[PDB]
Amino acid sequence: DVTTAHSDYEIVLEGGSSSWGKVKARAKVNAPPASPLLPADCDVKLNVKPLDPAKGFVRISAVFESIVDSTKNKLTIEADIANETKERRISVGEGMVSVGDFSHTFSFEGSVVNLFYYRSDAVRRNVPNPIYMQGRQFHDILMKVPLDNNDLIDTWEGTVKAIGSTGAFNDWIRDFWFIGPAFTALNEGGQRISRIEVNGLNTESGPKGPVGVSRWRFSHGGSGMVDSISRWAELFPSDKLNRPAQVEAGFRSDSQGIEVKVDGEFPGVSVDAGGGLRRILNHPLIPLVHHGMVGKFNNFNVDAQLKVVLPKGYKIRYAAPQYRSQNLEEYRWSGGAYARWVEHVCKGGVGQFEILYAQ
Amino acid sequence: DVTTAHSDYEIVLEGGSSSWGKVKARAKVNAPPASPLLPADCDVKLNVKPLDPAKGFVRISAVFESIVDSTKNKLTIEADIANETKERRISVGEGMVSVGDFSHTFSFEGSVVNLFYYRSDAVRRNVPNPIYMQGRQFHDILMKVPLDNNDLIDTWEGTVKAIGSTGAFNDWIRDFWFIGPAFTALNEGGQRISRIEVNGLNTESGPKGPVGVSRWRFSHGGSGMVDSISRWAELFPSDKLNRPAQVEAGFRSDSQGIEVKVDGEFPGVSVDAGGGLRRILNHPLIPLVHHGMVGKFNNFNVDAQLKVVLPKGYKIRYAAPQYRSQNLEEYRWSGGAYARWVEHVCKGGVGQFEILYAQ
Amino acid sequence: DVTTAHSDYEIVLEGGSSSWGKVKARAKVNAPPASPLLPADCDVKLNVKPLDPAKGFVRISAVFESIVDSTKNKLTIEADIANETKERRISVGEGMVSVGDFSHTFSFEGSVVNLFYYRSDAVRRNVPNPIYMQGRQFHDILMKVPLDNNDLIDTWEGTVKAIGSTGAFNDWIRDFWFIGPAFTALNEGGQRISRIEVNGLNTESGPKGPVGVSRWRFSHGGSGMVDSISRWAELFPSDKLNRPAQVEAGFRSDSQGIEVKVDGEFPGVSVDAGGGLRRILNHPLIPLVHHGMVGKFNNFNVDAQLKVVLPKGYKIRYAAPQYRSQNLEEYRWSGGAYARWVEHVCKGGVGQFEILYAQ
């Protein structure tokens, strides 16, 4: 037996200053996942449609479905979201969660204010492609859940009794919130979750059955690698959504290994690089930092290939690890310095791999 | 030179709902330990006897002996311990420490209260084999040490003067307490040690010589992987100790490598799995998480084998990584997906490897 | 393609209880750095001269020059520094920073008080070569920067407005201060940076242009591996600087790999070991702990050799990983247990490799 990682990644780019792209991925490794419960199979579906361009609103949906050991899980969430200002963004929404025989629903309203610690022009003009951006991000959340199970009233009253009876509740809550190795992953990425504030508890804010209502804030700090904070605008290109976008991702896994597929189509794949050039967006760092926590437990060979198809007439002007071949606007990366880049990022490395291209 | 890990693990299971088992292990790797002082040789002996079944009391002993670089160390501790309630457990005890020419003794009384943050029945019934359990655990400690060296009065007065003269003492103490990489290992496992409280300092609580007396509390939180908090009941099967149990473990190590042997016999090895099945208990996560911090520094081949001997007539119904062979109730795991599991766990992975069996 | 690490390290030792030595290193690996911006090329120059032996003063200089992606960076700092007491040390100094079209200058005065949490004699006498030393270190800093750009007045007023307007400023500042993975590296090494105090803000403390003036303190704790705290005296051998010392180090790097050279000459290389023996100083732990965070992302072979040249007549009495050869006072380590030690330390291991020698 030998442990090999087989992957194929594909990127097909829309033309113009359309930043749109199709992304496809297939991956196979015969190594165990680091889930203490297995088998672990999961499918995710994300869609997003322009709702009101002019007020900036987008309607986004997410369906998470999985089976763990044997337990069937489901979570959906659909929400309306828009930029109010450069740092203030707002949301109203709804969803449901389910695990085996249990389900509940929920609705919410939420604001999020993203603040960079500094905004120097001596930085702006001297660093062409900046990466690290330190900042802190402020969530303000109104959420409601119908209390229609009796598990829900039990957890409600357990919590209501926990608050007010403890006082280190907005501190210790993080122990519960960031379950398992999620806790550890906070510091791995230079991420800090502040203590919460509870600004109220209401019963019953909804005429149907009893409804449990939470008014709470938290804050999260990042030292620079946290894409949520560092890449606040970019990660939400409402402005480029001229039509509905979508991604389907899935994995199957067990003691024998991991299989994953990805298919999607969405803006943000390429960005203006300055100077008539464009690039594939900078690799977000959290995916690589957090997968790093699992990627080092078995030695593997890399059988990996990337294909990039540029729009018609476009040429690559520069590529970090260089490509192996080209055939009109199709470029392919395989072995050599690219296989070493793939080994590197799978294990936690964030070494830059850059592709700039122009007509 | 090539770096190989040679190991053999053996598990012989007592019948019935006896959860008792014999555990044996031998391990060899020709890679250096990550101790900044070497050679590093250590032997540990643990025993435990039923003292008063009816009041739940157990008498447990531990002897740690080591030699580091050249320094001879010894620590023993024997204590009486029992479950008072489901979360409150109590202890009274004594021991000694020694390093070269230095020794001191000590006696103690201690309570520990283990609290889960939540207890939902929607979880209980829908997840057959749950792993992550978030909680917090409260130590309340009366300890006494005879001040019979003058190193002991020096450390006493140094400490007495440190307290009261500092005020961030119950915070900074963690810097001293979790020496070296032990500090780091706290966050690795989703573990938090809260600040201490000091509830008094007494002289001299003992008629013989002067006696230094500390009344202090601390708290520790875990996000789910902390077996101490997550597996509170299980890790202390007083109820299954119908006779004295024991474990002898040892390692020899240096710049040339690591050798380890383990022999023991104790309850808790198998558990009822529900449905007439039993399993080997879930792998505790802290051993794997903390050994992970050292297991990634040299590449190695795996020459590893597990033998499980079931009681007479019992069959394995399921095994994660499957076994290679069987001969009556002896099952053996070697190479393939098992060697990959062993590589994985030695390096920090916690991928589930499950064995369920029944008559 | 195969990934190999090629290195050569050389140590030439001055005789007597001169602790002086020449250190040379060359390293090559064809693996990518974990910098999200590449190419990344950097040169560093450190010098140090006795200024006033009798008052213990040393004059030290540092020049950091780099190019990242395409951005040209420079930082120099020269300072006068001396031991006042065993734990209090003082500094006065100056420098400049520059990035592209931007530069500023600065002058400073600073004290640093290094405190060990404990000083037991039962430790001192029983552990011949102690490593872990827990402690905390207190910086007290007066710094001034001419406000001669308008980027500098902009950052000044932005900061002045940030202080006083926020209140969790001396907490959140760490998010900004420890940019990127630097934050994470704090906990990796058992290192804690406390909140700051701001003891004043002054304008304009300098007759020329406007001058921004900061009076601030911070504290840092280490659990034992932090060489700054654990090896406070040793890391600053002012007493052994009978002449000017120096080190030139440099690396070139990109998607293709990493190249590094080092040349220097300075005291502190060997230490009295007790018993007529001397050793190469204990490996500092932070270099190895922090490089560990990058060293595990690509598999590699080791083609490494260490040469040690002892002074004339000196013999090695003991070496951890043993040497392969000797020719008069030249000793060479290659392959076997040494290549495994090199793999180990490059990946984060701190396993002791010891060399003791005497006449």
Ligand code: BCL
């Ligand atoms: C995830 C890392 C950050 C974070 C990320 C930020 C960011 C960034 C945003 C929010 C915003 C939201 N966050 Mg938040 N926030 C986090 C912590 C949480 C927690 C929690 C209990 O821990 C809560 C309650 C909230 C909830 C809030 C809401 C008030 C708000 C809208 C959520 C939503 O519409 O769902 C989203 C629906 C999903 C479940 C999809 C999630 C999948 C994401 C993570 C992956 C994106 C896929 C991308 C790579 C592919 C795009 C293609 C698709 C076709 C679109 N956040 C952590 C600390 N938060 C949004 C906002 O500003 O609204 C005001 C927003 O832009």
Ligand code: BCL
């Ligand atoms: C280790 C991880 C947790 C923790 C684990 C918990 C748990 C769980 C328990 C205690 C309990 C105790 N803890 Mg505690 N507690 C920790 C921190 C410490 C520290 C410290 C200075 O940091 C202190 C003072 C205390 C001390 C206290 C005592 C008041 C009490 C009884 C100790 C004892 O009898 O020794 C024990 C004797 C030894 C030295 C043996 C230790 C070896 C252990 C760790 C390995 C078990 C071996 C097992 C795999 C094999 C079993 C076979 C044998 C034949 C039995 N804990 C950390 C944070 N603590 C017990 C209690 O509740 O009493 C009231 C208890 O069940």
Ligand code: BCL
């Ligand atoms: C680096 C890890 C520690 C730390 C290390 C300690 C130690 C130890 C010392 C100081 C001291 C100083 N620290 Mg400090 N301190 C740190 C955080 C910082 C920060 C910050 C903004 O984070 C600040 C403002 C300060 C600044 C201060 C100054 C007040 C003071 C003198 C600095 C100096 O002359 O530069 C130094 C010039 C350079 C830029 C060179 C730096 C390169 C170093 C790190 C490598 C040494 C090379 C060695 C291996 C080779 C020697 C050969 C040469 C020929 C000499 N420290 C962190 C937490 N600090 C000194 C003091 O006590 O003065 C009162 C001192 O001895």
Ligand code: BCL
């Ligand atoms: C509340 C969640 C936020 C969200 C938070 C984030 C965060 C965080 C990130 C992005 C990132 C991206 N987002 Mg966004 N962003 C939002 C939704 C917007 C909308 C929109 C108009 O609604 C669009 C089109 C996009 C699209 C963009 C892309 C520019 C970028 C993905 C680059 C890529 O090649 O992915 C490649 C596609 C894949 C390889 C993965 C596809 C797999 C699917 C399943 C994603 C699942 C994520 C998984 C880890 C689950 C986390 C969910 C939680 C558990 C709930 N975002 C919503 C509002 N987005 C990433 C980025 O690079 O930004 C700089 C990034 O880190």
Ligand code: BCL
């Ligand atoms: C105060 C310490 C606690 C203790 C705390 C813990 C903790 C924590 C754990 C256990 C675990 C176990 N404990 Mg207990 N538990 C206590 C004592 C009880 C008693 C008893 C009746 O006295 C018994 C019989 C057991 C036995 C049980 C087993 C169910 C389980 C081991 C499974 C195994 O296959 O190990 C296999 C045997 C080995 C592979 C190792 C044998 C090696 C010896 C030397 C153990 C040394 C540990 C080492 C890391 C040193 C730490 C000591 C500190 C530095 C002081 N415990 C005492 C009261 N126990 C583990 C578990 O899986 O629980 C879910 C676990 O994490």
Ligand code: BCL
């Ligand atoms: C303010 C900074 C401090 C400094 C802080 C430290 C720290 C911290 C350490 C040392 C270490 C050393 N210091 Mg000192 N020390 C100071 C300056 C003194 C002076 C002096 C008389 O001025 C001298 C001669 C020395 C020399 C000594 C040596 C005993 C020892 C290096 C052993 C070695 O073989 O290196 C081998 C040489 C190399 C392999 C590396 C040479 C490369 C150059 C470029 C160093 C760059 C470091 C790099 C990581 C950049 C960090 C700088 C910041 C970003 C600003 N120090 C100043 C006052 N020094 C190390 C040690 O082992 O101590 C126990 C150590 O960890």
Ligand SMILES: [Mg+2]
């Ligand atoms: Mg880590």
